[PDB]
Amino acid sequence: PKVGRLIYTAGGYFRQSLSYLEAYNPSDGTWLRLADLQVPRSGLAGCVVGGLLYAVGGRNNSPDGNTDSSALDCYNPMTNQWSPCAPMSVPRNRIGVGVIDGHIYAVGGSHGCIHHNSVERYEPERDEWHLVAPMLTRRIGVGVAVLNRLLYAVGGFDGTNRLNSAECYYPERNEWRMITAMNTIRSGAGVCVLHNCIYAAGGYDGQDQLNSVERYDVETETWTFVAPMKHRRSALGITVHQGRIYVLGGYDGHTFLDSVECYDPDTDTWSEVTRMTSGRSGVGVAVT
Ligand SMILES: O=C(O)COc1cccc(CNC(=O)Nc2nnc(-c3ccco3)o2)c1
Secondary structure, eight states: OOSOOOEEEEOOBSSSBBOOEEEEETTTTEEEEOOOOSSOBBSOEEEEETTEEEEEOOEEEETTEEEEOOOEEEEETTTTEEEEOOOOSSOOBTOEEEEETTEEEEEOOEETTEEOOOEEEEETTTTEEEEEOOOSSOOBSOEEEEETTEEEEEEEEOSSSEEEEEEEEETTTTEEEEEOOOSSOOBSOEEEEETTEEEEEEEEOSSSEEEEEEEEETTTTEEEEEOOOSSOOBSOEEEEETTEEEEEEEEOSSOEEEEEEEEETTTTEEEEEEEOSSOOBSOEEEEO
């Protein structure tokens, strides 16, 4: 094929919610603009299932109004087209998603002043949503990752407190269990899994955006700091591509970042590999 896997960035915020879909090719550093979202959105989550890109929740924060989204839309790289899917039970801004067994899990997020602890599961082959057990904590700006077929919800804001706690969901049981809490309080952090560990990068602690990064190891059941990113940021996009973590854009209290940093787990170092076509925060990112 002309290209390998690409890192897709959908939506985001800059002065207002965006409809951009762009793709970065790690092999030659080129960016490509694709079909716009049907509705602008930011604070959404992105994931892939069966070669299809999904844009979940978020909100359309515009000059003349704000509308939280319960929408799920699907993008097909093969034809460069967006398709509306069944919507979720409720709008979820600052949502988290994870994929397990080809099913998409929508986690927490908010609707107005409602901070969800609820969680629902989407089955693409049926285009239908079903709620599952709710998290033990209400979490918006929660980070979500999957490890050993278990869904992890990390940090966030419960409506009052910003959290350093994290919990794990066992689909086979439909039970949530708290795990060791992180070193740092983080809402709107970038959370992903890489080489059998969960990473939590950046975020906001209630006083400033963060550049520190920590890693959870399941057999020691502990969170350990790794090399920090060069640029502090919350509401960043994050994904994994061939053994490395990519963080995209974000917000640091002063700027909408276009910076994209890459983490090398073998040397424990971060490098700025490229820049988005324009700075922005709250993007949905995935690789396919
Ligand atoms: O809805 C989202 O996903 C993000 O919402 C955010 C995030 C960070 C800051 C804000 C506040 N909005 C904001 O600062 N807008 C703004 N700032 N500067 C401009 C601007 C500059 C020139 C023209 O407009 O617009 C909203």
